[PDB]
């Protein structure tokens, strides 16, 4: 079973299923979004091949005592962003793209959408699923908003820190984002 | 001029206004120019063939290639981004005649100004 | 002429052609194929209609596709642009031969209206 | 000869902006005439305008509208017509020779909006 | 070519008004501006202009403002007629008179500085 | 011939003020600019002002600032008359004196920085 | 221009649309011209070499260097900024063959829209 379409289908269903079960408790306690994002999603996403890009050539210099700390703090950072992101829930659709034959490459872009009558015109969010060698099943490693990436803006922004400070600089400073929500829902 | 040239291929799906013989640059300095642009009769997807000099020739494949604009009323060009080398996961320095795997779409105006501020 | 170039014709209607002229480019994915030919009106309803041509090498387009006019850069030419649709084999689709009409269409952009609906 | 015989019409306004003579008139983006004269009423100081239409098109109900809008983003100005609908029994008056439109809209100026809002 | 008559006015910030620039009412051109000068007692700008004579029913309650045409085009001064009512003295205009109230120009920098507080 | 004289003042960031630029007051030109230079120590720019003689009698307290013209014009050093007061607002600007208060120019990235971040 | 001028080196990361023979300005007055720009084949980073007039020769070793646009639609030009000079403590002056360290970088019309609400 390597068809990504069926995986995305079941993923959307399970996500909105587990999401529908809570309405007042989540806004009474934000500690549930950071939980449910780990309850699912994360088995489908890859961390190594993602967190390797933001480093750059400096990867060839990282000591084995430093790599694991960054690799551990990266997930703890990644949770909060997607946690805060989930602040909408208007019962919106998700019309998947139609089927297509054998992929002619080990890299494939797939597109979804989202529509609701209560909001602005819709928007598309491409995804990328990578066809690895012998991993059998495949994972996703990126997201594209709309002509804008999410690994591009951060590949160079955390820049001069790499030149002057080092990996040690990015460590700890990554986790130092606290645990918060918004009071404007 | 010295011309020990390499050639490479890439595919897209929307290229804005990138006409022929435009420059290509890394980090802000020029290293080559596009050559031949065409369309594909099997599925209709634009395909570009570019060429590189021989002085710089140590790029690992895990790299990106995007399109952007210059100034406020200038001409578009192709920016590049270098990655990392690591065994098993991603090796194979580019040999002549290969294709760049990654790509990113073109930035369109009007669309976003209609989207936001609605 | 541009040396031979056998072609065929298509028709369409609209609602506000903006500032389009004659002999304007038609393109797909930023690559030009054919040019426009004639524009006129309807003395029974007053709705603008356009007749364009297309070079005859490309011979595979689904019946369900979109047409839309737009602008380039931020202050230049206005050009048409079409988008191929997805074909379903087992169902009923069709190709486009000489003397057909495209189903749907899009309008055009204009100032004043938006800048007065918002931030007024 | 520029064109065949035509026929004329009049209208009034409140502020015509920078509209000069020899300006086009169009529907749906296609031009169908020109502009004749612009003058002032020496009794109430209100600007009026007189224009003409070619003899080809000969069926427009009375209920219609006229407005002003800028060309492109940074260009000239051109009048813009807008047709009503066809409804017998109710609105019948065909545009004859030398009549006046009922409803009209005014022009737009820059620095006024800045004071109006976003100040 | 007409027999014209002249009027005076004072201001506060000329905003780059160049001599020989049209005077308009409701968007229609009428008179021309004659010249601008300074005062050696108050240091304030004064302007002398002239008008055609056929139009002659503009009362006292009226306004003069400065405004620019197009986006970044030229600039001029717009006259504004005021509503007239009975009882009160209408006071018709004659040669060699002055306007009372008015308005001043606009400067860019201050608007930006106000948008950021 | 302009029977003029000279004035001196300081700044810190002159933007893009080439020589031969007006010294307008209330949108009226009444002078010019001759020399700009830099002191070989503290590294702070200074200028040389020249104004004509009829407009004398200026209180020693005033203001002076830099401004741009329209949207994409040039730059013109502008003045702002202060105030005249008895006793503790005395005297005038004699030949070759120094101006007190200033107001630096304006740059782009400062704005974008105050915004966003 | 017979007067001797002494040269300095610097490194950046994303210079943008800079071009050779452009002015260096302090406070608003021009002083020196830019000489050469290139890359390094070991790590790929933009490197610049510039020349400075000999009269001005009393700089503290702490300073700032950054590029920024001109007017509103103008080109690019470097911008130097004098740092803090401390007595007693060691500071000294900038001699030949040295390099300035901490520098900023350019900005192109895409990362702005990007960072705008991500």
Residue numbers in the entry:
A (entry chain H): 24 to 208
B (entry chain E), G (entry chain F): 35 to 152
C (entry chain D): 33 to 152
D (entry chain C): 34 to 152
E (entry chain B), F (entry chain A): 36 to 152
According to the publication:
Masked refinement and 3D classification, focusing on one MlaD hexamer, revealed two distinct species, one with a single MlaC bound to a MlaD32-183 hexamer, and another with two MlaC molecules bound, with final resolutions of 4.35 Å and 4.38 Å, respectively. In the MlaCD(1:6) structure, a single copy of MlaC is bound offset from the central cavity, on top of the main MlaD ring, predominantly interacting with a single MlaD32-183 monomer (henceforth termed MlaD1) but making additional interactions between both the clockwise (MlaD2) and counter-clockwise MlaD32-183 (MlaD6) subunits. MlaCD(1:6) has a Cɑ RMSD of between 0.7 and 0.8 Å in the core fold across all pairwise protomer alignments. In the case of MlaCD(1:6) binding clearly results in the 6-fold symmetry of the MlaD hexamer being broken, as evidenced by changes in the angles between MlaD monomers. Interestingly, the largest deviations occur distal from MlaC binding, for example between MlaD monomers 2, 3 and 4. Importantly, such a break in symmetry was not observed in the structures of MlaD within the MlaFEDB inner-membrane assembly, and is therefore possibly not representative of the physiological binding event. Whilst MlaC Pro124, does not make any observed close contacts in our structure, however, based on its position, the most likely location for interaction would be with the β6-β7 loop of MlaD2. However, many ABC transporters have been shown to have an asymmetric mechanism, suggesting the binding of a single MlaC monomer could also be feasible. The presence of two GPLs within the central binding pocket and a single MlaC bound can be reconciled by both GPLs binding to a single MlaC monomer.
